[PDB]
Amino acid sequence: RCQRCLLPEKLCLCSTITPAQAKSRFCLLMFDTMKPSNTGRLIADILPDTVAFQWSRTEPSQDLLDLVQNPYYQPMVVFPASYADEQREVIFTPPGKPPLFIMLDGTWPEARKMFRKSPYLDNLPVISVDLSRLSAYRLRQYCTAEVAIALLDMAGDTGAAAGLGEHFTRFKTRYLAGKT
Amino acid sequence: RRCQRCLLPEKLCLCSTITPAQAKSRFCLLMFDTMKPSNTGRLIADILPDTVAFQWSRTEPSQDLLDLVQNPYYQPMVVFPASYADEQREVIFTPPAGKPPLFIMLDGTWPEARKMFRKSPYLDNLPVISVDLSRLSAYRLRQYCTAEVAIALLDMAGDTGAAAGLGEHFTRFKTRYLAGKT
Ligand SMILES: CSC[C@H]1O[C@@H](n2cnc3c(N)ncnc32)[C@H](O)[C@@H]1O
Ligand SMILES: CSC[C@H]1O[C@@H](n2cnc3c(N)ncnc32)[C@H](O)[C@@H]1O
Ligand SMILES: [Zn+2]
Ligand SMILES: [Zn+2]
């Protein structure tokens, strides 16, 4: 197995990676800090400015707090609108200020716990994802990578959205064939 | 649900990725019947579109096939393991210089290629070329199928650009063929 791409050495895709540029930026809030089937790591392959943090219940990192409170960005929590309280601001599109998409990586019981017990995210708006936009990139819950492609298209980053789609498709195919 | 041109599930269609190459060598596929997706001889035509294919016949060979294996513009070779040749049969381990090579492939199952090798009087005066398969290492590829053999022959003839192009195309097909199988 390759160590960079985690695919068996006969199926390495590291030679095919070509990054794209986007006005949007991603922040990965990880619960365990990686398994080969985790799709959030594919985002950094196409957008190397992606930042990642290990989630902590008691003591959040000072690097993380300085980012979500940086007025340069318009931060927003990416989580389905059904899970939000009646007073929580919910939006359906990313507004001038470049978005900072905060993803909650992990299984659904863990992403719910991260959503419910992080006081530093409670004043941020929630963005509900229009997954219908995956049709324009010929893609069919939905993993962290598929949601990211929809967000890039929602913000006008078509070049980066198309790139992540071909890279994600390239990975899924070599992953299935590696099981054979 | 399956693409008609590449014979893979439409979600794994690779037709948009095909880029042809150019080579001094030419291929002639002698086939036993008409297609199963795991048959690899068609990948050669994707990268070298001047490939010609004929249906084998025990009684009446075609005149397009007979005129081509007697056209003195080419140097024709029967691609077959030398172990099955008569002791008087000329055997070679490299394509000669000058005249461009014309590789005659016997595509089918090993009982079918053996029958064609013995019952074709129009092929018996031609030399048998023995393929050097260790050349597949230069293309990161590990008997073998028809397409794998053709990559070696291209390398023996000095057509490295086309040998590499067919290398990617073969790996692409095999990867997407295994994935859609699961
Ligand atoms: C493996 S959990 C997938 C993650 O992607 C994001 N996500 C997935 N589906 C949705 C959705 N329908 N709406 C908003 N965010 C989502 C959330 O960050 C979630 O924790
Ligand atoms: C019978 S299907 C195998 C295909 O690979 C070719 N092939 C496999 N091994 C050899 C070999 N050792 N010498 C020549 N052709 C071979 C065959 O001629 C046919 O095209
Ligand atoms: Zn790799
Ligand atoms: Zn196709």
| Resolution for this experimental structure (Å) | 2.3
Check: CB of residue B91 under 8 Å from CB of residue B128. yes
Quick count: other Cβ atoms within 10 Å of Cβ B27? 23
Please indicate whether residue B147, judged by its CB atom, sits closer than 6 Å to ligand 2.
no
Size of interface A-B (CB pairs under 8 A): 23
Q: Which ligand is nearest to the CA of A77?
A: 1
**DSSP readout, chain B?**
-B-TTT-SBGGG--GGG------S-EEEEEES----TT--HHHHHHH-TT-EEEE--SS---HHHHHHTT-TTSEEEEES-GGGS-TTS-EESS--SSSPEEEEEEES-HHHHHHHHHS-GGGTTSPEEPP-GGGGGGGT-----HHHHHHHHHHHTT-HHHHHHHHHHHHHHHHHHHHHT-
Residues of B in contact with A11 (CB under 8 A): 175
Instruction: Give dist(CA A64, CA A51) in Å, integer.
Output: 9
Q: Which residues contact B91 (CB under 8 A, 6 or more apart)?
A: B82, B85, B127, B128, B129, B130
Ligand 1 atom 15, closest CA: A79
Do residues B69 and B75 touch, judged by C-beta distance below 8 A? Answer: no
Interface mutation vs chain A, best among B16, B171, B175, B181, most A CBs within 10 Å:
B175
A177 contacts in chain B (CB < 8 Å):
175-176, 178-179, 182
Tokens representing B53? 């294919």
Rounded alpha-carbon distances, angstroms, from residue B75 to B27, B114, B148, B160: 11, 22, 22, 20
Report the atom number in ligand 2 closest to the C-alpha of B130: 13
Task: Flag whether A141 is in a domain.
Answer: yes
Q: Would you say residue B117 lies in a domain?
A: yes
Residues of chain A with Cβ-Cβ distance to B180 below 8 Å are 176
Whole-angstrom distance, CA of residue A80 vs CA of residue A142: 12
Residue B106 lies in a domain: yes
- For residue A42, being part of any structural domain is answered with yes
Ligand 2 contact, B40 CB (< 6 A): no
Query: Which residues, listed in sequence order, are joined to residue A174 by a DSSP beta bridge?
Result: none
- In a domain, residue A18? The reply is no
Q: Is residue A10 part of a domain?
A: no
Look at ligand 1, atom 5, and give the residue with the nearest C-alpha. A144
- This structure was determined by X-ray
Selection from B162, B78, B153 nearest residue B120 by Cα = B78
Nearest CA-CA distance, residue B101 and chain A, Å: 32
- What is the secondary structure of A124-159 as a DSSP string? SPEE---GGGGGGGT-----HHHHHHHHHHHTT-HH
Cα A89 to Cα A21: distance, rounded to the nearest angstrom: 29
Ligand 2 atom index nearest CA of B82:
13
Determine, yes or no, domain membership for B166.
yes
Six token digits for residue A126: 């929630």
Give me A153's structure tokens: 């298209």
Pull the structure tokens for residue B166: 């067919």
Domain that holds residue A84: 23-179
Report how far residue B128's alpha carbon sits from residue B117's, in angstroms, rounded to the nearest whole number. 10
Structure tokens at A92: 């359906």
**Is residue A11 a part of any domain in this protein?**
no
A99-131 as b/e, with b when 16 or more CB fall inside 10 Å? bbbbbbbbeeeebebbbeebeebeebebbebee
SS3 of A101, please? Answer: strand
Q: Which two tokens stand for residue A53?
A: 């943090």
Q: What is the DSSP letter of A77?
A: E
Which ligand is closest in space to the CA of residue A8? Answer: 3
Total number of domains constituting chain A: 1
For β-strands B26-31 and B101-107, DSSP reports them as parallel
